[PDB]
Design a binder for this molecule. Structure first.
Ligand SMILES: *[C@@H]1O[C@H](CO)[C@@H](O[C@@H]2O[C@H](CO)[C@@H](O[C@@H]3O[C@H](CO)[C@@H](O)[C@H](O[C@H]4O[C@H](CO)[C@@H](O)[C@H](O)[C@@H]4O)[C@@H]3O)[C@H](O)[C@H]2NC(C)=O)[C@H](O)[C@H]1NC(C)=O
Ligand SMILES: *[C@@H]1O[C@H](CO)[C@@H](O[C@@H]2O[C@H](CO)[C@@H](O[C@@H]3O[C@H](CO)[C@@H](O)[C@H](O[C@H]4O[C@H](CO)[C@@H](O)[C@H](O)[C@@H]4O)[C@@H]3O)[C@H](O)[C@H]2NC(C)=O)[C@H](O)[C@H]1NC(C)=O
Ligand SMILES: *[C@@H]1O[C@H](CO)[C@@H](O[C@@H]2O[C@H](CO)[C@@H](O[C@@H]3O[C@H](CO)[C@@H](O)[C@H](O)[C@@H]3O)[C@H](O)[C@H]2NC(C)=O)[C@H](O)[C@H]1NC(C)=O
Ligand SMILES: *[C@@H]1O[C@H](CO)[C@@H](O[C@@H]2O[C@H](CO)[C@@H](O[C@@H]3O[C@H](CO)[C@@H](O)[C@H](O)[C@@H]3O)[C@H](O)[C@H]2NC(C)=O)[C@H](O)[C@H]1NC(C)=O
Ligand SMILES: O=C(O)CC[C@H](NC(=O)N[C@@H](CCCCNC(=O)c1ccc(I)cc1)C(=O)O)C(=O)O
Ligand SMILES: O=C(O)CC[C@H](NC(=O)N[C@@H](CCCCNC(=O)c1ccc(I)cc1)C(=O)O)C(=O)O
Ligand SMILES: *[C@@H]1O[C@H](CO)[C@@H](O[C@@H]2O[C@H](CO)[C@@H](O)[C@H](O)[C@H]2NC(C)=O)[C@H](O)[C@H]1NC(C)=O
Ligand SMILES: *[C@@H]1O[C@H](CO)[C@@H](O[C@@H]2O[C@H](CO)[C@@H](O)[C@H](O)[C@H]2NC(C)=O)[C@H](O)[C@H]1NC(C)=O
Ligand SMILES: *[C@@H]1O[C@H](CO)[C@@H](O[C@@H]2O[C@H](CO)[C@@H](O)[C@H](O)[C@H]2NC(C)=O)[C@H](O)[C@H]1NC(C)=O
Ligand SMILES: *[C@@H]1O[C@H](CO)[C@@H](O[C@@H]2O[C@H](CO)[C@@H](O)[C@H](O)[C@H]2NC(C)=O)[C@H](O)[C@H]1NC(C)=O
Ligand SMILES: *[C@@H]1O[C@H](CO)[C@@H](O)[C@H](O)[C@H]1NC(C)=O
Ligand SMILES: *[C@@H]1O[C@H](CO)[C@@H](O)[C@H](O)[C@H]1NC(C)=O
Ligand SMILES: *[C@@H]1O[C@H](CO)[C@@H](O)[C@H](O)[C@H]1NC(C)=O
Ligand SMILES: *[C@@H]1O[C@H](CO)[C@@H](O)[C@H](O)[C@H]1NC(C)=O
Ligand SMILES: *[C@@H]1O[C@H](CO)[C@@H](O)[C@H](O)[C@H]1NC(C)=O
Ligand SMILES: *[C@@H]1O[C@H](CO)[C@@H](O)[C@H](O)[C@H]1NC(C)=O
Ligand SMILES: [Ca+2]
Ligand SMILES: [Ca+2]
Ligand SMILES: [Cl-]
Ligand SMILES: [Cl-]
Ligand SMILES: [Zn+2]
Ligand SMILES: [Zn+2]
Ligand SMILES: [Zn+2]
Ligand SMILES: [Zn+2]
Lengths: 694, 694
């Protein structure tokens, strides 16, 4: 038999281990030769594994690199302009590497050049609420200051945006042990914690879905017209650089001015966490000076695209994609995911060699330049947008397979909730203490739904990975799954060695998953999802699950608005249309479900498969959200305050956010009303796609 | 047998005549009770005729009406402010009407109110080139002047836009006998010419595809948020009013200043056609004063939507639509079209009652408020956009069936060229002298293709009718056909009694088509097209015909650019990518055609039917054209200088237009290059939708 069990049993922990080792011996930074060589290797192997075609799709996109002969660093400078302290020029390499070349030093990708000097202000996590506290409550002015912010809580590009709008002239990001050092575990190489010399790389763009900064809307192909740098999308206007906590301690220890406003502003270092501005009495005349010399450069990137043609519906695509480019060795991010995808391709190819083909076409992607802003996936989707929006069934992402060893973490469209529950009930739990129990059982026990008893937590999709263009721009049903930790307040912060030189094969093999059983479990979840999507006769989506969450999101946004009852009275702000639409959606979805259960007729089936495929597509508004034209889904967008987090009813959410501070309340509440209309209309229009067609 | 011949033979000239009479006894102005009553009648009859469902879809949109107790008119005013001449307050009603009430007086719909007074400048047809001649060559300044312009050549809303940008403070439109009085024929009621008291109504909006001015992007339903009037789309900023040639003679006879620059500026009245500004010596102190008091008002409109569910592909829609609202009696515009649609529905219903159903679903529409800016069709399409873009096969328009009695006129997508040629070869010519010959033969003889021997002329779709939203916004294959005159320079001007009170049943029955044989022929062309689209197993589109025209349009836009060889050198302006894309499109389209001819497999068929349906859809750019977000088709848009005319490669065309006058040539040619990239990319992406799917 060639069924899902055949597929799942063919997957081997030992193969994933071998591939992980193979993918993590040298750095694979986007735009470098080593990363092109790995692309060619994967293309060759996917051919050998049995795919019908495997091609490289290349693009020429804006990337950013430090200057090898003019290093970035930060100084404390004295009255005379003597640099009395300098931050490190590189992370101490881990054991046995120390002679690896081409390890890119820590830098903030896309920082402009500059040598700003000034007084420090400490801004906690540099969140919107942190700046509100500084400016509104503490009356501290960041204008012309260098801000220092700890990593964690929100995407770093939002920190930099917030610092810019506060008038900062530079930003220093650092890793506090409060957020990157788990109590009781040892620093790398003796455990999985971040050493004091470790630093988190990462880009600081605010692309809002655009892809390559120079070519928003269109692929960066050979004849592309590029914007000038001054009109590029998303580039920061002030210099930015990341440091480790040994260096941060040196910059923070002398800080003066106001005390931290409360304990949620204090990290774990032995410093006061004074907000500043500037240093205490004796050092009041010393300044901080940044030296940033990185350059932005148009550089070729390569996606590997493999096709397994469907036997029955070859013009319906189920896509499994994850990136290949890494900051350094990519031991977790992304190669723990890429190794899982490699083993999935191998298993599918095994079945194919025995004469099986999936019902629908499966596309496999190894994306490039994810680390520089989701560039590879976005440019490819821009190139192929018409094929994807008329043929795309679903997209399953496959970045890091593990960020912990505790339990499963899933974010996906409501359309896939039932599929995930059903699949996980059929898979074995890899967890100690749940031998012979299902993954569904361990996951539900360890990560209970906050709404429903006996169900696991599944979160909304946000952004910060390659599914963004598929879901938020194109409206293709998307999902992602991995193994995670038990550390709730660190949900968006990353594991301690995130984007550091210390993320190596050895990290994974010694400390995360020595048996590769969690990798195997994740391969079964991702692969199992792809198998069901590409093989089930009726697409495995339950429209009724969308109706349940739409009501939850409508209650939530109504509750936010109802914080302002006098204004809702004055401006006649009614949510009645949105609740009406959600009611209608619930009723129509129930009737559609009955018909779907009640029909030998392939035209009726496909008609109904097309209704299921196009339902996520119906939540797309071609006009986009306000000032964010590439975020087009009306139900979900990346939060405007934190790209990683999803926000529901984002148009209405942002119209309500901080509304009590707007100078013209009539205009502000008018825009809330406009967003309620758009949302109600889109929900009703999506409902109507599920009605009888004629 | 229930085949196309059965359908075509059931259509009767005598029924079309009876329906025309029935639809033209009282005015059916949008938003009035009489037009709602006619909607209800059509809904009832289409039910009786056999459709599966017939519903009214209503919307509340911005309309515009004169003030019944405060009439619009224009005066010549003297030194003291005595009004010494006044234009007419109404057109003399035709015989036997004179006691019809609710005939709306001539006005320009959506004019703002005002009583501007000033000196006249005569601007010929108020085209872009007419204003270029005035300002650049003759150095006449229109700022603060009232302009007087003859109707014809271009859409009146473009005239008003042009007058506004020239700084005019009011616009007077009039009908010159040069353009609205055919030599040798008598004025209504004794012939089909415009009397001197006749006046052409019409709106003067510049909506660029938006639909209701207050709700761009979204249907004007019961909970819609509306823009304030100041932010409405497309409204003119200066008062405008239309007059007949008796009145125009009075305003033009006293005109002084410069002589007309050449004979193409002179109409047929016995006046000099001096450009002005102002009157000759003796009258130099008299002025012209407008009095406009019309009001814009949100008003309910009603579309009738009938469905004939398909037997096999009910989720594929072929749409036959035309409007019902008229300025007055609508003898030609629109009821000559509406009567044809009514007879088509009757014939289809006849077949249905005998047990036949079309393969695909056919939707029939009687649109409202077409005359006020395509409002009914646009709002409906905004409401149903997701259904239309995933299910819409084709749209066939059905406004006026006749504007002459000479030969056929067709505008459609290249995808329908072969369908039109084939259908017309099977229909009888109604023409004298072509008894027993095909319509194809008479049409080709009377309207030869300018490119190809032995083929008839088929023009590009422009705008000015209800197909706009379907074609230019949504990318649904569209076409239109009617009987026309032999008067080439009057292509966009309208027949003489266009939008006048004199367009009556009697006009048609006495002077255009007493036997209703041209109406019947048009019913056979429109109905035959709908039948083939809704019934052919393989959709009747030939992608190779698009490849031929894309090459023609590429040669044309390249030729325009090559007027500027030095700039193409300086700025490295290459059309190579666009010709490459067109070459690829031609090659892939040829191979697709071979496969389409070479395949019992309904999935392969529908897969290939979907490739055919989505090919027009592939030319849509979701970002729209520059500053015209609702014109999204990259190959075709309404000309920026004349809404009625189609323009090919419009983005590149407008970037090139008058480029030698731009102040920053680097920037201007950069934008040409950007538009070449967008066009090349879109053509290649459309080509790729025709490749093998996997
Ligand atoms: C959820 O689905 C339901 C259908 O089950 C759908 O109900 C529709 O609601 C609209 C607006 O609420 C109804 O619109 C009415 O239509 C009638 C004609 O049928 C008009 O006469 C009404 O207008 C009068 O009353 C208005 C309200 O007081 C006045 O403002 C106006 O000036 C008129 O005097 C009104 O337009 C529509 O008929 C129903 N359709 C049904 C019941 O089938 C509802 O809209 C859906 N929700 C959403 C958000 O789409
Ligand atoms: C029409 O269809 C054809 C396919 O039949 C398609 O041809 C493609 O053209 C592109 C660009 O013209 C080719 O791109 C090249 O790809 C190779 C790798 O395969 C690269 O090495 C090339 O880059 C080098 O050379 C460039 C040009 O001198 C340099 O600018 C660059 O720095 C590199 O040194 C280059 O990107 C592509 O391979 C073909 N594909 C084929 C032949 O299958 C053509 O693009 C289509 N037309 C349109 C408008 O899409
Ligand atoms: C996840 O698994 C559940 C449980 O198996 C699936 O739901 C079940 O799906 C089947 C097939 O539609 C349903 O069977 C149907 O029952 C009705 C009688 O009410 C009958 O008319 C049909 O012919 C058919 O037998 C079954 O009721 C349903 N069970 C429940 C509790 O909903 C579900 O579809 C799976 N989700 C997927 C595949 O996304
Ligand atoms: C308009 O009418 C023309 C003429 O009938 C149609 O073109 C013809 O279409 C048929 C069906 O595809 C073609 O027949 C095929 O011929 C090939 C042999 O070359 C064979 O492999 C197929 O099995 C089939 O017999 C025919 O060649 C073709 N004629 C020409 C001159 O092109 C055309 O399709 C009609 N247009 C429509 C329906 O839009
Ligand atoms: O430019 C971008 O948009 C992102 C590029 C790059 N992306 C990442 O590094 N993404 C990492 C980020 C981890 C930290 C935040 N994590 C999450 O949001 C998250 C949420 C749910 C799951 I299941 C898995 C991860 C990842 O998704 O694994 C970056 O964040 O620097
Ligand atoms: O607001 C709008 O966009 C148009 C509203 C209203 N539309 C019309 O009156 N359309 C009339 C206009 C006739 C004059 C221009 N004619 C054409 O462009 C034309 C071209 C091809 C064919 I076949 C038939 C007619 C019509 O299409 O029959 C108007 O022009 O005032
Ligand atoms: C990763 O595995 C690949 C594939 O097994 C290795 O590449 C092969 O190496 C052998 C021996 O040098 C060559 O003969 C083949 O041409 C390579 N195959 C390819 C690239 O498809 C590669 O050596 C491994 N990398 C590491 C670091 O172990
Ligand atoms: C921090 O680094 C700077 C830059 O390399 C050092 O300052 C330089 O020192 C050399 C030799 O003393 C001088 O010739 C340069 O002119 C200095 N450059 C400057 C100030 O930009 C500085 O010594 C380092 N500080 C510490 C504490 O190591
Ligand atoms: C147009 O034709 C319609 C339908 O034949 C006429 O409306 C009918 O009139 C009869 C007699 O008054 C009524 O009993 C029916 O209820 C009407 N049917 C409808 C509206 O569906 C209408 O009278 C005709 N109009 C003109 C001007 O002749
Ligand atoms: C043009 O119409 C205007 C407006 O009705 C006429 O002017 C009015 O005439 C009456 C009676 O003579 C006066 O009471 C009003 O005050 C005038 N209103 C104005 C000037 O706005 C005028 O007589 C008409 N001219 C002609 C030639 O018929
Ligand atoms: C890097 O710095 C070196 C040495 O100071 C300089 O010569 C070169 O221009 C820089 N490289 C860049 C800007 O890419
Ligand atoms: C913040 O500080 C700068 C000092 O240059 C000043 O320009 C800005 O107005 C200040 N903001 C306020 C309103 O405190
Ligand atoms: C793996 O699981 C054990 C047992 O709970 C835990 O103590 C250890 O820290 C985990 N490793 C990681 C990297 O989370
Ligand atoms: C029309 O004019 C009359 C009489 O002058 C006036 O009372 C009324 O306000 C006007 N109607 C409108 C503006 O709709
Ligand atoms: C046209 O005339 C007006 C007179 O008020 C003037 O403001 C404008 O500059 C003139 N245009 C030119 C440049 O001749
Ligand atoms: C109808 O055809 C005749 C014969 O050519 C022509 O003279 C007459 O003017 C036509 N009627 C119209 C309205 O064009
Ligand atoms: Ca791009
Ligand atoms: Ca609208
Ligand atoms: Cl992931
Ligand atoms: Cl028409
Ligand atoms: Zn990653
Ligand atoms: Zn990463
Ligand atoms: Zn019309
Ligand atoms: Zn009209």
């Amino acid at each position: 038999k060639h069924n899902m069990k055949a597929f799942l049993d063919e997957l081997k922990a030992e193969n994933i281990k071998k591939f992980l080792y193979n993918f993590t011996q040298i750095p694979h930074l986007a735009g470098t030769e080593q990363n092109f060589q790995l692309a060619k290797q994967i293309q060759s192997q996917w051919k050998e594994f049995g795919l019908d075609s495997v091609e490289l799709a290349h693009y020429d996109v804006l990337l950013s690199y430090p200057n090898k002969t003019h290093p970035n660093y930060i100084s404390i400078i004295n009255e005379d302009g003597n640099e009395i302290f300098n931050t490190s020029l590189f992370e101490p390499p881990p054991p046995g590497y120390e002679n690896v070349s081409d390890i890119v030093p820590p830098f903030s990708a896309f920082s402009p050049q500059g040598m700003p000097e000034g007084d420090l202000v400490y801004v906690n996590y540099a969140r919107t609420e942190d700046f509100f506290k500084l400016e509104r409550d503490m009356k501290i002015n960041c204008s012309g200051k260098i801000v220092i912010a700890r990593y964690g809580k929100v995407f770093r590009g939002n920190k930099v945006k917030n610092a810019q709008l506060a008038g900062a002239k530079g930003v220093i990001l650092y890793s506090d042990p409060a957020d990157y050092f788990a109590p009781g575990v040892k620093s790398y190489p003796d455990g999985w914690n971040l050493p004091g010399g470790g630093v988190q790389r990462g880009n600081i763009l605010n692309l809002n879905g655009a892809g390559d900064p120079l070519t928003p809307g269109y692929p960066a192909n050979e004849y592309a017209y590029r914007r000038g740098i001054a009109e590029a999308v998303g580039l920061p206007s002030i210099p930015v650089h990341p440091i480790g906590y040994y260096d941060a301690q040196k910059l923070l220890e002398k800080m003066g001015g106001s005390a931290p406003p409360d304990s949620s502003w204090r990290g774990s270092l032995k410093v006061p966490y004074n907000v500043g501005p500037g240093f205490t009495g004796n050092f009041s005349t010393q300044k901080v000076k940044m030296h940033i010399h990185s350059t932005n450069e148009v550089t070729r990137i390569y996606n590997v695209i493999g096709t397994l043609r469907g036997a029955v519906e070859p013009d319906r695509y189920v896509i499994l994609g994850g990136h290949r480019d890494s900051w350094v060795f990519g031991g977790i991010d992304p190669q723990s995911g890429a190794a899982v995808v490699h083993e999935i391709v191998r298993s599918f190819g095994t079945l194919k060699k025995e004469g099986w083909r999936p019902r629908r076409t499966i596309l496999f992607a190894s994306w490039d330049a994810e680390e520089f802003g989701l560039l590879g996936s976005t440019e490819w989707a821009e190139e192929n947008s018409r094929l994807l929006q008329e043929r795309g069934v679903a997209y399953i992402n496959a970045d890091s397979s593990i960020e912990g060893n505790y339990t499963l973490r899933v974010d996906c469209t409501p359309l896939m909730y039932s599929l995930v529950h059903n699949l996980t009930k059929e898979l074995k739990s890899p967890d100690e203490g749940f031998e012979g129990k299902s993954l569904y059982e361990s996951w539900t026990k360890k990560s209970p739904s906050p709404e429903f008893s006996g169900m696991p937590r599944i979160s909304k999709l946000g952004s910060g990975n390659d599914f963004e263009v598929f879901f938020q721009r194109l409206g293709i049903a998307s999902g992602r799954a991995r193994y995670t930790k038990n550390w709730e307040t660190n949900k968006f912060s990353g594991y301690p060695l995130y984007h550091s030189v210390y993320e190596t094969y050895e990290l994974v093999e010694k400390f995360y998953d020595p048996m590769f059983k969690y990798h195997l479990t994740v391969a079964q979840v991702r692969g199992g999802m792809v198998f069901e999507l590409a093989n089930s006769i009726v697409l495995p989506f339950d429209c009724r699950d969308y109706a349940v969450v739409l009501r939850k999101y409508a209650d939530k946004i109504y509750s936010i608005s109802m914080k302002h009852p006098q204004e809702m009275k004055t401006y006649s702000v009614s949510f009645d249309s949105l609740f009406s639409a959600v009611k209608n959606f619930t009723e129509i979805a129930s009737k559609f479900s009955e018909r779907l259960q009640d029909f030998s007729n392939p035209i009726v089936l496909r008609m109904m498969n097309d209704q299921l495929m196009f339902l996520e597509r119906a939540f797309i508004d071609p006009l986009g959200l306000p000032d964010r034209p590439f975020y087009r889904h009306v139900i979900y967008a990346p939060s405007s305050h934190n790209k990683y987090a999803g926000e529901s009813f984002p148009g209405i959410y942002d119209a309500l956010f901080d509304i009590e501070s707007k100078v013209d309340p009539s205009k502000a509440w008018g825009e809330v009303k406009r967003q309620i209309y758009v949302a109600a209309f889109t929900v009703q229009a999506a409902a109507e796609t599920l009605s009888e067609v004629a």
